[PDB]
C-alpha cells in the first residue's frame, strides 16, 4: 500500500478523501476531532506543494445531519489558519475549473459527497469506477490520498473508485488506524479485554462471535444498549420501559443472537450488575439483584452502575490488550457519563496497549480530558467491522491501487 | 389544477419539469418521441418570454441509460430550431448562476436531476421541499411547469417538492394526458376494451383486476409475457424453454394472481389462440387448434398469431372506448413486430375514443407510422398505476399546489 513519502506532490493535483462527517446539532458541528486526525496529512500536502481537493460526505440524504460542506470549509480554515475555499460543486464544470485554478500549496473542499446519486451507493470497484464522479474528477486530479479510515468499510464511489484509475495512498491518519487494530487484533499477548457498548447491537454481536471463536479476546465486557441486549438474553426482566426501548429499536431481533452466543460463550462474557436509571430527572442508580429494581419497569436505563464500572476496572487494569468501542451509557448527559468516563479512564490508566473508537457515539469524550489511551480511533462502524474479521473495502482498494501502479 | 394560461411568463423564470427519459443504446438517445411530446410546451413558453430552464432525469444510478443530459440538449435545440445550452449543474452555484443569466425567451437544460441523490428517492411532499434541491432551486425560479406525466407515479423532490413553495402547473401534454386517460377511465359507454401486453406482469395484473372489479372494462384482451401468465394459467402449457423464461424473470410467481382473477372474470379475459416462435432468428407462427407445436420445450415465443390479431381487431371495431398498453411480442424485433402493428392499427381505425400507452416498451412504434389512435401517452408505468386506480403523487402534488396559491 502506497503512503505519502512513495510521491513527489510538488504541483500535483491530490483528491483527498476523508472523513469529516462530524457530529452535528442544529446543523452546526459539534465536534472537530475527525479535522484534527487529519491536520497531518494535509499539513504535509500543503508543505509538498501539492494542490490539495478536499472531498467528505456529511450525514446522508434526507437526514437531519446532511448539511453543505460550508462550516466544514471554515472549520478547517480555522485549524490550517489558511483559507480554504467551499466548492459548491462535486464533479460538474465548476468543480473541474475550480480545481485547475488551484495554486501550489492551496486547499480547497468540494461540495458535501454525499449530494451525489452514485456516491450514496456501495458498489463494487468495477462499477464505482465507471461512475460519473470518479470519470470527471479523474481528468483533473493527479493522485488520490485516502484518510477516511471511519468509512473504510463502505464500498462507495469516492473511497474506492479511483483505485484502479489513480494511485491511491493511504494518509498517516489511515496508517495509524490500521497499524494499531491490526496490532490489537493479532496480539499473542493476554488478558485480551473487549468492551463494547454504545447502540450498534447486530455488529457488535459480530465482533463478540469472531473475537471469542477465534481466540483473539479473552473476555467481553458489555455496556450500552449492547449490554441491555446480552442482560435480557440471560433471563433477567430489565423491564417494560426498557423492553420497549429495545422492542423500538429492533434490537429485540438479535436478543435470539445473543442467546445463542450467550449458550456458547457464557462464561467469557461480562454484563453489568448494576444499572442507572433516569428517575424524574435525576441518576438513581439500581442493583439487578436488590428489590429496587422493580425502578426498571418504568424508568430508563441511561448508564451502567457504579459496582460494575468498578468490576470493568479490576478486569482492564490487568489486561495486556485492550480494544473498546462505544459509550457504557447516555455519554451525552453529565449525569449519565459516569460510567463511560470511568471505564474509560480504567483503560487510559491500564498498562494495556489500547484502543477506543465509537465515532460519533463516544464524541462527548472531549469534555473529560482522559489521557493515556495507545490509540484513539476515529472509526465507530468501521472499527466493528474490522473486529468482526470483515475485510474493508477501501483497505482492499488501496491493496488493489498499490499493485496495479 | 393550474393551467399555461393561468400565469403570465413575461420574463419569468419557469423550472420545466419534463421527462426526456429516453431509451438509448449505447449511452445514445435511439428515440426522440418524449422530446416531442413537449415541444407544445416549450413554444408557448418561449412565446410568453419566459426563461425556460429544463430538468429530466435520464436512467438511474449505475444503469446503462444513465447519462448526462448533454445530448438531450442538441435534441432539444434540433426540434426547437433553438439552440439550447446543457448547463453542467443541477442546483448548484454554477447553476443558478447560468439561470440567472438567461435572457427572455431563452432555453436552457439542467443536468440529469437523478445525478441528485435526494432525486432518486420517493417521499412525501414535506421532505421534498426540504431538500437542498429544492430549497436551493427555488431561490431563483419563479414557477414550475411540470409536463412529466410519464414519471407522474413518482414522488421526488424535482416533481413533487416545489408544490407549496412555487405554483406548480401542468404543461400541456401532462394536461393533455390527464384528460385523455380521466376519459376512458370513467366513461359511462361501452364497448369498453383494454390490450394489455409488455412484461409488467405485476403491474398489469393490477390493472386486469382493478378495471374489471370496478366495471370500467368490458372485455381484456392480452398479448405478451402478460398473455403467456394468462394462458399458462388458463392451464394451456407453453413447452419448457418458455415455462423457464418465465421463472427467469419470475413470472411463475404470477400465474396464481393470474388464476384467482381468473376464477373470478374468466369469461372477460380473451388470451391467444396462436402464437409465434424464434429458432435461430426464424419466425414461426403456431396455432393452439393446430398441431406441430414442440420447440417450446427448447425455444422461446416471441409475439402472437395472425389468427388472435384478427380476432382482437374484430372486437376493437366494435369498442366505445379502447385502452392499450405495451406491445404484443418482441417490437424491436423487425420479424417479432407483426402482431404488435397488427393490433396498434386495429385500435386506430376503431370509431372509438383509443389510448395507447407503454413508454420505452412502444418506442419501435416510431417505425411504423400508425395514425388514427386518439391518445398516445408518454407514459408506461405511469400509465399503468393510473389505470390500477392508484394515486399519482404528481397529479396529488399539482392539486395541492392549486389549493394554495
Ligand atoms: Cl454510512
Ligand atoms: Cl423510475
Do not use: W
Amino acid at each position: 500500500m502506497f503512503r505519502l513519502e512513495d510521491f513527489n506532490f510538488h504541483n500535483k493535483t491530490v483528491f483527498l478523501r476523508v472523513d469529516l462527517n462530524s457530529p452535528m446539532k442544529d446543523g452546526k458541528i459539534i465536534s472537530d476531532a475527525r479535522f484534527k486526525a487529519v491536520l497531518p496529512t494535509i499539513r504535509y500536502l500543503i508543505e509538498s506543494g501539492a494542490k490539495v481537493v478536499i472531498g467528505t460526505h456529511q450525514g446522508k440524504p434526507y437526514s437531519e445531519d446532511y448539511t453543505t460542506t460550508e462550516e466544514h470549509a471554515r472549520v478547517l480554515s480555522e485549524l490550517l489558519d489558511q483559507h480554504v475555499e467551499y466548492i459548491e460543486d462535486i464533479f460538474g464544470r465548476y468543480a473541474r475549473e475550480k480545481i485547475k485554478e488551484l495554486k501550489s500549496g492551496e486547499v480547497a473542499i468540494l461540495e458535501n459527497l454525499r449530494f451525489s446519486a452514485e456516491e450514496v451507493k456501495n458498489k463494487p470497484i468495477e462499477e464505482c469506477e465507471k461512475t460519473f464522479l470518479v470519470k470527471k474528477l479523474s481528468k483533473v486530479i493527479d493522485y488520490v490520498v485516502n484518510d477516511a479510515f471511519a468509512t473504510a468499510h463502505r464500498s462507495q464511489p469516492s473511497l474506492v473508485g479511483f483505485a484502479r484509475i489513480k494511485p491511491m495512498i493511504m494518509g498517516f491518519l489511515m496508517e495509524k488506524e490500521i497499524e494499531a487494530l491490526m496490532r490489537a487484533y493479532y496480539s499473542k499477548d493476554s488478558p485480551k479485554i473487549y468492551v463494547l457498548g454504545g447502540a450498534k447491537v447486530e455488529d457488535s454481536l459480530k465482533v463478540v462471535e469472531n473475537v471469542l471463536r477465534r481466540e483473539r479476546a479473552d473476555l467481553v465486557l458489555t455496556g450500552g444498549l449492547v449490554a441491555n441486549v446480552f442482560t435480557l438474553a440471560k433471563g433477567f426482566d430489565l423491564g417494560r420501559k426498557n423492553v420497549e426501548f429495545m422492542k423500538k429499536k429492533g434490537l429485540l431481533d438479535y436478543v435470539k443472537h445473543a442467546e445463542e452466543i450467550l449458550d456458547e460463550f457464557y462464561p467469557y462474557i461480562r454484563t453489568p450488575v448494576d444499572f442507572a436509571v433516569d428517575y424524574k430527572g435525576e441518576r438513581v442508580e439500581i442493583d439487578l439483584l436488590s428489590e429496587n429494581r422493580g425502578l426498571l419497569h418504568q424508568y430508563q436505563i441511561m448508564d451502567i452502575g457504579k459496582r460494575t464500572a468498578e468490576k470493568y476496572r479490576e478486569i482492564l487494569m490487568k489486561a495486556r490488550i485492550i480494544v473498546a468501542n462505544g459509550p457504557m451509557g447516555v455519554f451525552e448527559r453529565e449525569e449519565f457519563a459516569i460510567g463511560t468516563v470511568e471505564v474509560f479512564k480504567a483503560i487510559a490508566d491500564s498498562p494495556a496497549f489500547s484502543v477506543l473508537g465509537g465515532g460519533h457515539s463516544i464524541a462527548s469524550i472531549q469534555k473529560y480530558g482522559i489521557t493515556g489511551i495507545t490509540h484513539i480511533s476515529t472509526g465507530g462502524g468501521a472499527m466493528l467491522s474490522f473486529f468482526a474479521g470483515e475485510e474493508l473495502p477501501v483497505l482492499r482498494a488501496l491493496q488493489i491501487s498499490y499493485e496495479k501502479f
